[PDB]
């Protein structure tokens, strides 16, 4: 029991320190953009789990008995249920926010908090000391399966579906970095919380604990640490793809055709190079990196057509001079839209 108490105290201290440091850094930097809000709320939920769950776990085991009225037990159990709901629900909210961000280049947090508050309501009736009541056929089975479905099964399945959609759309890079951070967070949450739910289901359906308790208590400190290691701004303070590839290929083809044009000797070579230019410009204008994009590619095609006309007239040097404006248009728009890879 002494070892259990010491381990719980160490975990509580580590979680409190990590979450406090992360919240302090976030507040000092934000003194208001996405990622910051969701991560701050996740850290607040981890702090709620530490304070309202781990501390009662220490306080009951200090004397091996509960000291307080029935309402005290009701409130503490309700708040523990709220926090354990909120962890997964706000991870899901972060994943959905990332999906929204990658779809198109805080309400969800409040929705997750409301879900956590309202889905823990029966905890004000089960415990009444606070010897928990039971149903006539079985009391633990129904609520245990309910908790498994609502905390672990459905949120993890939804996050997996959202991640599948996100990897679809990304592969169809700050956004990629944030997606990877969210994926690591959900993987850590699953790894930390799966054995606890599995053993609670086995205890329900099959009529020791401290090791799984410590393993499930490790997520509340791992999440802020991995976020800090995966975020550049916080680290400093503490101290789609296929279309882009097609655009890059079309732009390099345009550059090669420009090089051919500048070294061309007769009108036939200029005409062939400009034909390849027009094909590449049309193919790139097809791809989605949009009104300015299409307008710039219309300008490019118009310049290519003008150079083609000049080459048809036999004015090779004038055609090359006109096609030199393609470099200016490229530096104006193609490079600007290629700099969007930094977002990705």
């Amino acid at each position, epitope marked *: 029991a002494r070892a259990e108490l010491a381990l719980l105290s160490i975990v509580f201290v580590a979680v409190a320190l990590s979450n406090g440091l992360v919240l302090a850094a976030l507040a000092r930097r934000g003194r208001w953009a996405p990622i910051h809000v969701f991560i701050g709320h996740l850290c607040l939920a981890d702090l709620a789990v530490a304070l309202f769950q781990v501390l009662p776990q220490l306080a009951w085991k200090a004397t091996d008995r509960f000291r307080g009225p029935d309402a005290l037990c009701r409130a503490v159990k309700y708040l523990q249920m709220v926090g354990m709901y909120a962890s997964s629900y706000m991870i899901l909210a972060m994943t959905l926010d990332r999906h929204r961000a990658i779809c198109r280049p805080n309400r969800p947090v409040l929705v997750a908090w409301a879900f956590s508050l309202l889905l823990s309501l029966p905890q004000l009736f089960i415990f009444a000391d606070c010897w928990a009541c039971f149903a006539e056929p079985w009391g633990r089975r129904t609520y245990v399966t309910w908790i498994a479905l609502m905390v672990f099964v459905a949120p993890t399945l939804g996050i997996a579906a959202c991640q599948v959609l996100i990897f679809r759309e990304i592969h169809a890079a700050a956004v990629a970095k944030t997606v990877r951070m969210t994926l690591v967070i959900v993987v850590v949450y699953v790894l930390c919380w799966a054995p606890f739910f599995l053993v609670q289901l086995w205890a329900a359906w099959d009529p020791p604990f401290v090791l799984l308790m410590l393993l499930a208590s490790l997520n509340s400190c791992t999440n802020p640490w991995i976020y800090a290691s995966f975020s550049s701004s916080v680290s400093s303070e503490l101290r789609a793809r296929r279309q882009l590839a097609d655009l890059e290929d079309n732009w390099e083809t345009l550059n090669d055709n420009l090089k051919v044009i500048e070294k061309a000797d007769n009108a036939a070579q200029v005409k*062939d190079a400009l*034909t*390849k230019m*027009r*094909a*590449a410009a*049309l*193919d790139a204008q*097809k791809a989605t990196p949009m009104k300015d994009f299409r307008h710039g590619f*219309d300008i490019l*095609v*118009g310049q290519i*057509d003008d150079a*083609l*006309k000049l080459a*048809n*007239e036999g004015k090779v040097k004038e055609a090359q001079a006109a096609a030199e404006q393609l470099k200016t248009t490229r530096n104006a728009y193609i490079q600007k839209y290629l700099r969007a890879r930094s977002t990705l």
Partner: antibody
Amino acid sequence: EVQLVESGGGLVQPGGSLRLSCAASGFNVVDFSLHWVRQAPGKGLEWVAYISSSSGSTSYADSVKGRFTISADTSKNTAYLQMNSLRAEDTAVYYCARWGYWPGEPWWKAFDYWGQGTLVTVSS
Amino acid sequence: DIQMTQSPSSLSASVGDRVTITCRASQSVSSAVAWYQQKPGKAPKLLIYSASSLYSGVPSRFSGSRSGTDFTLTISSLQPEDFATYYCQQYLYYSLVTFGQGTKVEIKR
């Protein structure tokens, strides 16, 4: 509706001259480039020439380069194809098609409207 | 200098069948490929433009598809009016338009 009609087709001796005409009604020639396409009897389609009324740019195919001259007249909304040195391979049917200007959807609609064409036959 | 190679020079099918005509460009012409239908003794009529968009006025039984430099015209249901000649044409530029050899659709017997 808008349409294109053709005239001036007929029978000429080899090495002669003939000016085909293409009257477009319902639309202006300054909005569309006008192309002359040729189909030999029993053979497939073959592009011959094109004229851009607005920019004044014109082009011809290799087989008719130098012998044909295509011009436009926006006063009558007509296109003219003067054909000279007509060899025996020019017996065909000539169609006068329109084509929109870049940019936009009109350019993607290639040869949306045609004319009925005129039969040009050369023989001694 | 860009050749369109319409593979089936002749096709035979009955009413109600699904037929497919394939055309191949020498170079990359993006999606600038059109499909025309010509009956004997009449001017060609535009069926498909931009290699996928059917022209406003033609029935919906005609469709077009692109895969790299391979373009495909598909007629899902044959009709008595469908039997005619079909041409593929690339229109990358005004002075570079080339037509295919054609595909005559006959009646199976």
